Amino acid sequence: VRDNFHIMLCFSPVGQKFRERARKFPALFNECTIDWFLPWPEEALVSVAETFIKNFDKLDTKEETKQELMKHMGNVHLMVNEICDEYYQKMRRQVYVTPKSFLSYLNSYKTLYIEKYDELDQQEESFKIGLNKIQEATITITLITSLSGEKDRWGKGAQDISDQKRKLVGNVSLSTAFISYCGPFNAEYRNKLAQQRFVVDMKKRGVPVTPGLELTSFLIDDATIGEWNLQGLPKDDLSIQNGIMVTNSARYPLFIDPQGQGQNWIRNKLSAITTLSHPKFKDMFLKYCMESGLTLIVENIENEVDPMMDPVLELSKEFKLFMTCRLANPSFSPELSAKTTIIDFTVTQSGLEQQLLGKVISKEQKALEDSLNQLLADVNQNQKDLQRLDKNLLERLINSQGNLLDDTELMDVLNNTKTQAKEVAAKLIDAEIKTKEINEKREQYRPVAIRGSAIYFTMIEVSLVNWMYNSSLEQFLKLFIESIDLSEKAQLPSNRVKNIISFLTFHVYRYVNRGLFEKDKITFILMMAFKILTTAGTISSGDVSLFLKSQKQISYLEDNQWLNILALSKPFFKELPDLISRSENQWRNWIDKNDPENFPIPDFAESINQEKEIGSFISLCLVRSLRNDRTLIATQNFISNVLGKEFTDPISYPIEGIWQESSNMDPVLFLLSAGADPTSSIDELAKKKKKFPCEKVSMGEGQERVARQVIMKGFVEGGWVILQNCHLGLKFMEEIETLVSPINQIHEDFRLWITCE
């Protein structure tokens, strides 16, 4: 048996466990031979490129450029390695690569090249049909000057796509690279970095390429774009490339989905579902979808794969499958990147303000939306009318395909062309009537949307400050729409825009404070102020870092103080530590005086402090650098200034008031600290307004079924339940979300109260 039992072990080189696993078991690395596999060098990659280009060089015929093509393709691969490294280095988000994706990229290149070569060259065959029309007209010889633009397009479009045909081959390469590889990337790296990267490769290679990307334009007809925009696809750029990426469908995809754009899109795109965790799903739902094609959507990936999921992944020929994640910043394995494409639907603020703009136009007065959608439908149909003009030109040009001139009705046809342009002129006028009127109706509100987006991207980051400060966009949307309903319209619409800016901020602010902890109270308001000013006031992130982080000259002050002199010393911070600051005339009392900021103000820059557009921030850089002792009250002070003193004021939550928020279909969590519990007060209220004592179940071990049966009693009746100590025994928590649902109906007046740590 030992003579004929060979053992082949294949490990990863990276991670954590490999090295100490080797140290744990000596015989493992001892007896076995050891062999390394370095990554493929450029020679191997060009070899693969020519193995795949020989069989694919049917239409791409060019000597002395093919060899440079295969070379440059290797260069592209070596580069996406480096881009991966840089992304992980800066953003601490994992990215991987495999030769399988390179092969798939070659597949995409070949397939979409034969497709676009054949299609666009049938169109260029039609450019040559235009040449045939010109030739037959000339040799046979009113219309010749009417077809000035027509003959010009017929010649020059073909001549451009032709003389740049190798540059257009380059364009195909850029497009298919950006498709296949640049799925999982953020907006700074997506286009900018990748584009400059590929075009510098092309310039160094000296192979010819066309100026201008316009990736979306020459990929998909805008008719399907509009059709999707009816299907809920967001009207902005990033969603456009995302839809393209799903369209190409090189492999089954997997989305990073902080908000839920993809789930709703697929829910609407062609479908109009079965979760991963279900005993029937693993057996039933699989066989139904695999033998009759139900499309089997999944929505609960959390990096944990039931292994049976995989060999299904890699035999009905009518079956597809889209599956997505929920929690952002995934930690997907390298090979989970090998199988499926990855797409990030991390919302940018840029699209966010348009979405909020649409929703405010809705709720503030529906007549604005009536005018909006009316003119928008009209102008969309008028774009389609320009398309119908194009159809009319094509009909004029190739329906007869001979004897166009003998058709004297062609004269009427020529006139018909003119008539269509006339309605385009009306549409042209509408483009002005749109781009001012709706725009000013939007300019009344697009500041608001800006603020709204700012607020949201503030409250995102506190989640990274600590877990459990996590919430959706949906709750924020409910709060936003409500705020509009609560106080928005009185009269004098511009004044009510200013009242938006007053009220919305306070509403969302208080909502988040209800969950915040003491030491984080001051911080969230501080971040809100900065994120407000990073757009309007254009406050430098460098000056922010100056405000966060930071002696020969002066003699009286302390070494503890001289550290701070050098801290401030390294615009006019490096211009006024001299004899101005070293006067030592009256500021000695100042540094002695308590509350330096308020009564004994620095007169070092009296006008700068007077202006106040930035003078606050200047005063604060000064206060921190000089006296870190009194940072926090100064923090309260300029918060009161730039945001209003209403923020720096006490709040205490009336539990009777809070009860009004809790509908039956939402629970009440409680993030408590040592030496504090509201349980007595909750019971007291349940004796005051409600007439019965609540039931209580403490988490632990062997309490799931007890909790479930008491909850069922509450469902049928309408009592109150008090869970306790959820910080251990978390396996029951995931069940609760399924229970509290619209499906299983619940009697009114049923509340739930949750406590944890």
């Binding site: 060979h6 082949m8 072990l9 050891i34 390394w36 020679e43 070899s47 495999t98 049976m308 090998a338």
Partner: protein, 272 residues
Amino acid sequence: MFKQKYFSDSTYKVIESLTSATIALWNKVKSTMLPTPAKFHYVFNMRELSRIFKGILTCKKDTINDAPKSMKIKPELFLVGLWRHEAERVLADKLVNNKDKDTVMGYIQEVSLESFSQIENEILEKYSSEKTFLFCDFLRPDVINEDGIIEEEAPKIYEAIDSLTELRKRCNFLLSFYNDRNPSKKMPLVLFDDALKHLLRISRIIRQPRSSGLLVGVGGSGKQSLTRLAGFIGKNLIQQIIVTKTYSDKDLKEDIKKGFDDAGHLGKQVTF
């Protein structure tokens, strides 16, 4: 081993010099290049000397048959080339950067010149040259020829010579075979020079009686893909473990029992 041919008028003294020059190489390499926590497994002992010899001891008379090749080959030349390839594959493999490889090959050339102080110009012309020399393989050199049945005769097994063309052609031949053996094989394996070498190394380890080899590399390097062919050529059966919905221990035990009974009672050849 020596007292079989008796044709070594001078190659016996050489052979002893090989016995000592392996030791000289062992001393130099073991001293010079060390383990650090990024290259912790750079560990050397007396095992590798045994492995070197275990590789050498083969071809009781197949080494003598230089007459078919005679590619400017004296009988000793093939022997020193075998020594070189052996020392490379037992020492010049488990090293991380190609530079480390380049220095061990420099060591090898220096030591070969040191011992081989009687034909040094010939080795410099032919095998100490960086050009490819004596790729050793078992299935390429002989062709079944499919006379009456496909597997007409077991190929000669001991040795092969240096060439890349017929290597790739038989590899593609074999790839087509593997395609029609396995339903839904779905294996677009691209065969380039380094991939061919890696398949050769897997062959070297799998074949040997009482051998095994740890394979390291990032995913996508293909080792899991390469081993399937490498096992099929060697007739070895292969089985993988499947982690059920319940992750437990009994699957391992029953699978190993079946493996032994394949390699025991039945006595077949297997791989894990």
